[PDB]
Design a protein around this ligand. Structure first.
Ligand SMILES: C[C@H](CCC(=O)NCCC[N+](C)(C)C[C@H](O)CS(=O)(=O)O)[C@H]1CC[C@H]2[C@@H]3[C@H](O)C[C@@H]4C[C@H](O)CC[C@]4(C)[C@H]3C[C@H](O)[C@]12C
Ligand SMILES: C[C@H](CCC(=O)NCCC[N+](C)(C)C[C@H](O)CS(=O)(=O)O)[C@H]1CC[C@H]2[C@@H]3[C@H](O)C[C@@H]4C[C@H](O)CC[C@]4(C)[C@H]3C[C@H](O)[C@]12C
Ligand SMILES: [Zn+2]
Lengths: 52, 72, 1339
């Protein structure tokens, strides 16, 4: 996850607009579903008492 | 009813009990006094003619109202 | 006359001649933003004034300065249509060309030796579209201006609400834009107390002493002098007689030896004149008149250097005793009177603990941050930085203006730091407000409240982001890395963009653009909210701002506000109101010199208007600008009045300048209760566009401007001829004179077809021009939603009769006839978007195939093979718009169900279906379907079909447009090859593409031909590259939420029809729910046979004092009578002669109108198009407080052969017997507020249930059970309804076994109930037991 955050901040300010995970699949040596997995796994839970 | 239909009555009570206290400060009685109850000056005939029953000269009334204006 | 106005020219009443045309109604939004984002070479405002504020950023003396050079706004990735389609924020990249220069640490003063340069990327900034709205996540948003209190000095009273006696206290705050506050509060015992930032109060004069003032000059500042003399006999005094005006003499006022007033007398104006006309220059009184005064200054011995008496000393007999021994002759006491010049600073001196400057700074520091040891120059430093630093504290330029104006300073601008001058002027103004010469400030006073707008709020958030980015860059620069770091490896684009994007994307001043209407958008843009970050809330205010002030005139609408929770906080801007150069609102006024009202206008702000005698808009003028009265109604300072001829300083620009755009479309606004017009504007702002937008038969002429200045109309961009019109695009061969020299071109507008606004109304433009028809600049080419030829048609004028008619309009209801529902003049289209996403369950993907378990083939004649419904199929509730199934693994089924499976050999499917079906009740036509697909997935058949369609349509559009531009260019070049190059029609056969290389002189004609040929080649190259980009955009992966495979969006087009339960409304605040749509026969019908269309209740007329509806009814009947006469003449066709005669008569018809139109300059076919537009009924304008008085309405009702009294005799439609007491029947403009019933009506028998509290949820908008609250529980408790309440609280809502038992009992014909226990209660038990508490149910 830490690798992901660092490389994402870097591509955001080097590749113009933002990092697409298809692009992180190359910028890292990972299999591009590992990346989607690790991105959907690192997020924290929403508090069920957060008021809309 | 509605918003405007009760708002009318709120405004109407506001206006009526705002007219009435300003109209109750008006003197309607008759008792000529001839001597300003604070300074003893003689209240002139005309200033007693407008408001019958006025018991202060114009100077002392201006003073007392200036004092009232700060709630003292 | 404009070509779009000779189509249907609106008979305009209203007598005042307009002096200043209506502004551009959207001007605040567009103005403030494009002032925010603009290359403006100075620190006026915007981005660069936010870059200079932090650039250059130096190291900590590090000999390395990162300096700004310039910036630029990138090109937007997506244009606004694609930005809505994809759900993106339409914005522009922001490049910045910083520059790192370095000096090596030797000399001289940082030798610039090793510098760099770059272009950095700091964040994207959203962009305001051409109508002043943003696209933030595909949704239209609007940044409502805020109304916040400006920096400066304020004086308030706190009137009689803290002390018991009721005495007011009169504090005087000083709030700077940045720094420390300063407050000056009296006390109940009349003590000036200065409290620096909101902590503990201090005595007043301690701050003066800290200013290096001591007591003697303090008293000289804050007082007048009185000089007693020991005149050899008991201390006789200096006297000027006007000082005594209000005295009660403790002695015999005598001069000349002559007694002026006997003792005891309250000193009179009489004796005033006696004194000065006789000029008493020194009086003699007893000694106990000086016995109780106070001495001005120091007094010390010539004997032993001992104090005679200290400065600010109460007097006595021994004090004058020692003064005599000192030989003193000048007793300096003060002139303190209870009435005017009261002693306040004197007693505040008495209470002052300290005595000199060091003591004052000691006390101040002990208050500021206690605990630490103080120190002489340490406290000096703290104080003299508190309000005297260019660095820390600053009343900005607006703050300085408000300051130097709120004290009556001749100057208007100065320092950003305070002064002894400033704080002493503040204290003086405060004590003189206490004395009674002056007044406290009204808080709502619009001279005390600025206006941030979208730009002035975006730039502040940009400044927050830039502050954090500069602190990061500074800490990084201090790290002596190298001269190798380039200023993009150092500066992060996360903080800036994050702060500005959370401003625009989520904050109380960024709202959904209400769009159900043209007027709704245009009045939500011009809105002045008083909430949000930086502005007061609802609780804290509170009726300070909840009300109108006599300086709202011409700045903020007095009537147009949302009634309900926040009244008077969301005040909406008036018509002509502008914003000052500072942020203050200003309005125009005609400059009226000595007696003549010049037509030069003059924008006065709020702070200044209260120093002039402003005229009255309805003040007559004698053809030169001289008021034809002697006295004239004006408003000098708040209170209006009569002022003589030669006193008026300004006049009003036009009579609609007090009301907003919303409340200026009401005719006869001056005949309505105020709150009725408020409700009327608010309910006009919700009108739903209709099928056929009509027009107001009674309007105020503001319709045209409100509709043009809104976005929805497709107004022309340049004069010319309509070359090819069509239901989707208008092509305009521009004139040659309004043509650009090279790059001929022709303006081709594409029109937005059926698309959904934010409120699910259908926004769709329609061409109002015809092929071959001329157009001029600023004309109207296409009516948007709710516009008729560049007029705002929000409703439909129907024939209404005011009479009760059988209780069917009992309270407020409205009896609509069946013609209203057959004619489809309220049938309104709503475009709804239904989504269906395929997620990634843990059990696997979700498909969208057209094969779904447990549904017969009959329910799938709509879905195609790919699973998604055909475009154009007419669906209704329960049908499947998308066929999606999710894997169910595994079932683990029941007993006997297993036997039933074995018996019939079926297999429970591995999947269950979650397919997108139309929500129940809806019934409409699927009019569009888009398929967003994740990039990893592969498109199904339908997605690739729609890509085929999109690419072919993009090609066709680009090529149609390039062909139209080709044709224009070719025809222009041909018209050049007509003269000079003569092949008259020896040129119309050879290859047209062989015209870029054909014959001519080498004249300017030849230069033009070369330029035009280059235009041709540029068109080719440009449209080629545009098609390539467009194709790559169409066939390029869509970005999606994490976990979503694909998304299928369907757009039903429901078509609502008016039905009992909808809300309608006149413009005069007369709402009402349609209660019955009775047949035609049953409606009241006049003697001629035509029935009224809508029967309204008369009883709602006098209660609610809106006579505007009755007068609009009369004038509407009059106008439709004129229309009837015109139509019978134009149907029984007479000729242009009689027709022109009748229109000419009906067009003059008034008092001194401003609307002289004459059908002497018309064609005779240009009168026939007109008088056909006037056959449905001839419109009538009626400016707001300048309407058509009843004399003119009688005149117009007499023009047609209607009855003058405005009343007809209707006959009953059911019994045919005439209603006695003749009724009012006219034409009223009925809106249709989109409180439609079928978004109101819902039910629920059983459904979902919440997850923790097992209560009814719905959530599908909305299966929610009713919110059976607490007050209903008491309604049931007042009854003996104990079983109804018990089942209403246990089995209907919570008890998870009682509810299933109840359903089973009901379906089994037994209405018993097993009460069980509410789940809320046993959850409560579990939680009480989860503390250290044991709570059981004993038996
Ligand atoms: C209503 C609430 C306040 C409105 C601002 C906003 C603030 C953050 C929003 C959530 C986040 O997007 C994360 C997450 C994305 C999922 O894919 C869909 C669900 C989640 C939980 C969202 C639902 C909702 O919209 C949230 C709670
Ligand atoms: C009348 C006018 C000529 C004036 C001399 C010519 C010049 C450009 C022509 C249009 C373009 O071809 C684009 C488009 C192609 C479609 O297929 C048919 C419709 C369109 C709108 C055309 C109609 C017409 O033919 C136009 C207006
Ligand atoms: Zn008196």
């Amino acid at each position: 996850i830490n690798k992901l955050n660092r490389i994402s901040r870097q591509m955001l300010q080097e590749m113009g607009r933002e990092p697409t995970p298809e692009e992180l699949a190359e910028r890292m040596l990972m299999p591009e579903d590992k990346i989607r997995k690790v991105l959907k796994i690192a997020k924290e839970p929403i508090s069920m008492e957060t008021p809309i | 009813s509605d918003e405007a239909d009760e708002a009318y009555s709120v405004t109407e009570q506001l206006t009526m009990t705002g007219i009435n206290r300003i109209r109750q400060k008006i003197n309607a009685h008759g008792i000529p006094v001839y001597l300003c109850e604070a300074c003893g000056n003689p209240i002139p005939e005309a200033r007693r003619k407008i408001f019958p029953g006025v018991t202060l000269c114009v100077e002392c009334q201006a003073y007392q109202e200036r004092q009232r204006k700060h709630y003292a | 006359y404009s070509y779009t106005e000779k189509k249907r020219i609106r008979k305009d009443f209203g007598k005042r001649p307009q002096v200043l045309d209506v502004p551009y109604l959207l001007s605040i939004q567009l103005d403030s933003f494009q002032k925010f984002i603009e290359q403006d070479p100075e620190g006026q405002y915007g981005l660069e004034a936010a870059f200079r504020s932090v650039f250059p950023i130096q190291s900590y003396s590090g000999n390395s300065e990162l300096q700004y050079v310039s910036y630029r706004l990138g090109e937007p990735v997506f244009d606004v249509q694609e930005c809505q389609i994809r759900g993106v924020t339409y914005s522009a990249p922001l490049r910045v060309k910083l520059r790192l220069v370095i000096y090596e640490r030797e000399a001289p003063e940082g030798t610039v030796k090793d510098i760099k340069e770059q272009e950095v990327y700091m964040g994207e900034i959203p962009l305001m579209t051409d109508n002043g709205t943003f696209v933030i996540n595909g949704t239209e948003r609007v940044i409502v201006s805020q109304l916040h209190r400006s920096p400066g000095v304020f004086f308030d009273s706190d009137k009689g609400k803290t002390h018991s006696s009721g005495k007011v206290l009169y504090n005087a705050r000083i709030i700077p834009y940045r720094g420390s506050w300063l407050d000056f509060e009296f006390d109940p015992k009349d003590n000036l107390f200065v409290r620096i930032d909101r902590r503990r109060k201090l005595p007043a004069t301690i701050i003066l002493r800290a200013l290096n003032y001591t007591t003697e000059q303090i008293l000289d500042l804050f007082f007048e002098k009185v000089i007693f003399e020991i005149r050899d006999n008991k201390l006789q005094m200096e006297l000027v007689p006007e000082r005594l005006r209000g005295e009660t003499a403790s002695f015999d006022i005598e001069a000349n030896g002559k007694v002026y007033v006997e003792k005891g007398r309250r000193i009179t104006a009489r004796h005033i004149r006696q004194l000065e006309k006789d000029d008493v220059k020194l009086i003699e009184v007893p000694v106990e008149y000086i016995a109780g005064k106070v001495v001005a200054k120091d007094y010390i011995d010539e004997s032993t250097g001992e104090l005679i008496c200290a400065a600010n000393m109460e007097l006595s007999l021994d004090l004058l005793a020692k003064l005599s021994q000192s030989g003193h002759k000048r007793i300096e006491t003060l002139f303190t009177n209870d009435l005017d010049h009261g002693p306040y600073i004197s007693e505040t001196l008495r209470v002052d603990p300290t005595n000199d400057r060091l003591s004052a700074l000691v006390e101040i520091y002990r208050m500021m941050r206690p605990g630490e040891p103080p120190t002489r120059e340490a406290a000096e430093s703290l104080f003299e930085n508190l309000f005297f630093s260019e660095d820390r504290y600053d009343l900005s330029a607006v703050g300085r203006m408000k300051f130097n104006r709120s004290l009556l300073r001749e100057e208007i601008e100065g320092s950003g730091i305070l002064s002894k001058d400033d704080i002493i002027d503040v204290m003086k103004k405060l004590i003189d407000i206490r004395n009674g010469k002056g007044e406290v400030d009204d808080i709502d006073h619009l001279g005390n409240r600025r206006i941030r707008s979208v730009g002035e709020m975006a730039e502040n958030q940009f400044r927050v982001g830039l502050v954090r980015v500069e602190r990061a860059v500074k800490e990084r620069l201090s790290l002596g890395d190298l001269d190798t770091l380039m200023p993009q490896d150092m500066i992060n684009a996360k903080p800036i963009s994050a702060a500005v994007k959370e401003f625009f994307g989520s904050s109380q001043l960024s709202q959904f653009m209400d769009q159900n209407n043209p007027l709704s958008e245009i009045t939500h843009k011009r809105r002045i909210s008083a909430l949000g970050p930086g502005g007061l809330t609802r609780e804290r205010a509170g009726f300070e701002v909840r009300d109108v002030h006599p300086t709202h005139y011409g700045r903020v609408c007095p009537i147009e506000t949302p009634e309900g929770p926040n009244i008077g906080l969301i005040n909406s801007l008036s018509v002509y109101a502008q914003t000052n150069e500072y942020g203050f609102l200003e309005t125009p006024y005609r400059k009226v010199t000595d007696g003549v009202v010049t037509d030069e206008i003059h924008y006065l702000s709020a702070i200044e208007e209260g120093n002039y005698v402003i005229a009255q808009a309805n003040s007559n003028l004698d053809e030169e600008g001289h008021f034809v009265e002697d006295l004239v109604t004006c408003r000098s300072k708040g209170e209006s009045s009569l002022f003589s001829r030669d006193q008026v300083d300004y006049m009003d620009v036009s009579t609609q300048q007090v009301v907003s755009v919303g409340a200026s479309l009401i005719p006869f606004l001056e005949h309505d209760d105020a709150n009725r017009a408020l409700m009327g504007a608010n309910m006009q702002r919700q009108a739903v566009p209709t099928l056929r937008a009509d027009k107001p038969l009674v309007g105020t002429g503001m319709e045209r401007a409100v509709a043009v200045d809104s976005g929805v109309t497709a107004v022309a961009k340049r004069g010319g001829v309509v070359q090819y019109v069509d239901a989707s695009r208008i092509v305009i061969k521009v004139n040659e004179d309004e043509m650009y020299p090279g790059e001929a071109g022709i303006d081709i507008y594409n029109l937005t077809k059926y698309t959904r606004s934010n409120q699910n109304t259908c926004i769709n433009q329609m061409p109002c021009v015809s092929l071959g028809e001329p157009v001029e600049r600023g004309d109207v080419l296409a009516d948007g939603p709710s516009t008729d030829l560049g007029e705002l048609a929000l409703g439909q004028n129907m024939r209404v009769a005011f009479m009760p008619w059988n209780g069917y309009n009992f309270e407020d209801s409205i009896l609509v006839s069946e013609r209203v529902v057959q004619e489809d003049r309220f049938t309104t289209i709503h475009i709804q978007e239904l989504a269906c996403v395929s997620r990634d369950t843990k059990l696997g993907p979700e498909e969208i195939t057209a094969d779904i378990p447990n549904v017969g083939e009959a329910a799938l004649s709509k879905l195609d093979e790919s699973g998604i419904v055909y475009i154009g199929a007419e669906v209704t509730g329960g049908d499947i718009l998308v066929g999606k199934v999710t894997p169910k693994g595994e079932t683990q089924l029941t007993p006997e169900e297993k036997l039933l499976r074995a018996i019939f050999g079926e297999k429970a499917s591995d999947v269950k279906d979650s397919s997108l079906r139309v929500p129940n009740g809806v019934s409409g036509t699927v009019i569009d379907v888009q398929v967003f697909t994740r990039d990893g997935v592969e498109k199904d058949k339908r997605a690739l079909e729609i890509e085929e369609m999109q690419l072919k349509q993009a090609k066709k559009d680009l090529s149609e447009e390039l062909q139209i531009l080709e044709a224009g260019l070719f025809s222009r070049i041909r018209a050049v090859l007509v003269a000079g190059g003569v092949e008259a029609e020896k040129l119309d056969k050879l290859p047209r593409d062989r015209w870029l290389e054909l014959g001519l002189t080498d004249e300017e004609k030849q230069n033009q031909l070369e330029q035009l040929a280059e235009q041709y080649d540029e068109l080719k190259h440009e449209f080629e590259k545009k098609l390539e980009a467009k194709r790559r955009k169409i066939t390029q992966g869509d970005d999606l939420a994490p976990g979503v495979l694909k998304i299928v969006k369907v757009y039903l087009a429901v078509k609502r029809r008016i039905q009992p339960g909808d809300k309608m409304a006149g413009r005069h605040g007369n709402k009402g729910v349609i209660s019955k749509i009775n047949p035609i026969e049953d409606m009241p019908y006049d003697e001629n046979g035509t029935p009224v269309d809508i029967v309204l209740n008369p009883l709602g007329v006098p209660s609610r004092m809106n006579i505007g509806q009755i007068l609009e009814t009369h004038l509407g009947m009059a106008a439709k009578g004129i229309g009837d006469k015109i139509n019978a003449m134009l149907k029984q066709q007479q000729e242009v002669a009689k027709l022109r005669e009748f229109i000419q008569r009906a067009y003059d018809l008034g008092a001194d109108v401003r609307q002289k139109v004459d059908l002497s300059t018309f064609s005779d076919e240009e009168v026939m198009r007109l008088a056909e537009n006037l056959r449905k009924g001839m419109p009538i304008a009626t400016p707001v407080f300048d309407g058509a008085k009843e004399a003119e309405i009688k005149e117009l009702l007499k023009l047609g052969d209607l009855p003058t009294s405005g009343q007809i005799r209707l006959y009953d439609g059911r019994t045919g017997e005439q209603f006695e007491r003749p009724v009012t029947v006219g034409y009223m403009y009925m809106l249709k507020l989109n409180h439609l019933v079928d978004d109101k009506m819902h039910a629920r028998s059983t459904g979902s249930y919440s997850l923790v509290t097992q209560q009814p949820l719905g959530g599908k908008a909305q299966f929610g059970g009713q919110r059976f609250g607490e007050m209903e529980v008491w309604a049931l408790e007042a009854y003996g309804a104990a079983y109804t309440l018990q089942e209403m609280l246990t089995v209907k809502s919570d008890d998870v076994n009682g509810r299933t038992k109840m359903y089973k009992n009901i379906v089994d014909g037994n209405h018993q109930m097993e009460p069980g226990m509410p789940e809320s209660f046993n959850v409560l038990l579990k939680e009480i037991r989860s503390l250290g508490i044991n709570i059981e149910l004993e038996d």
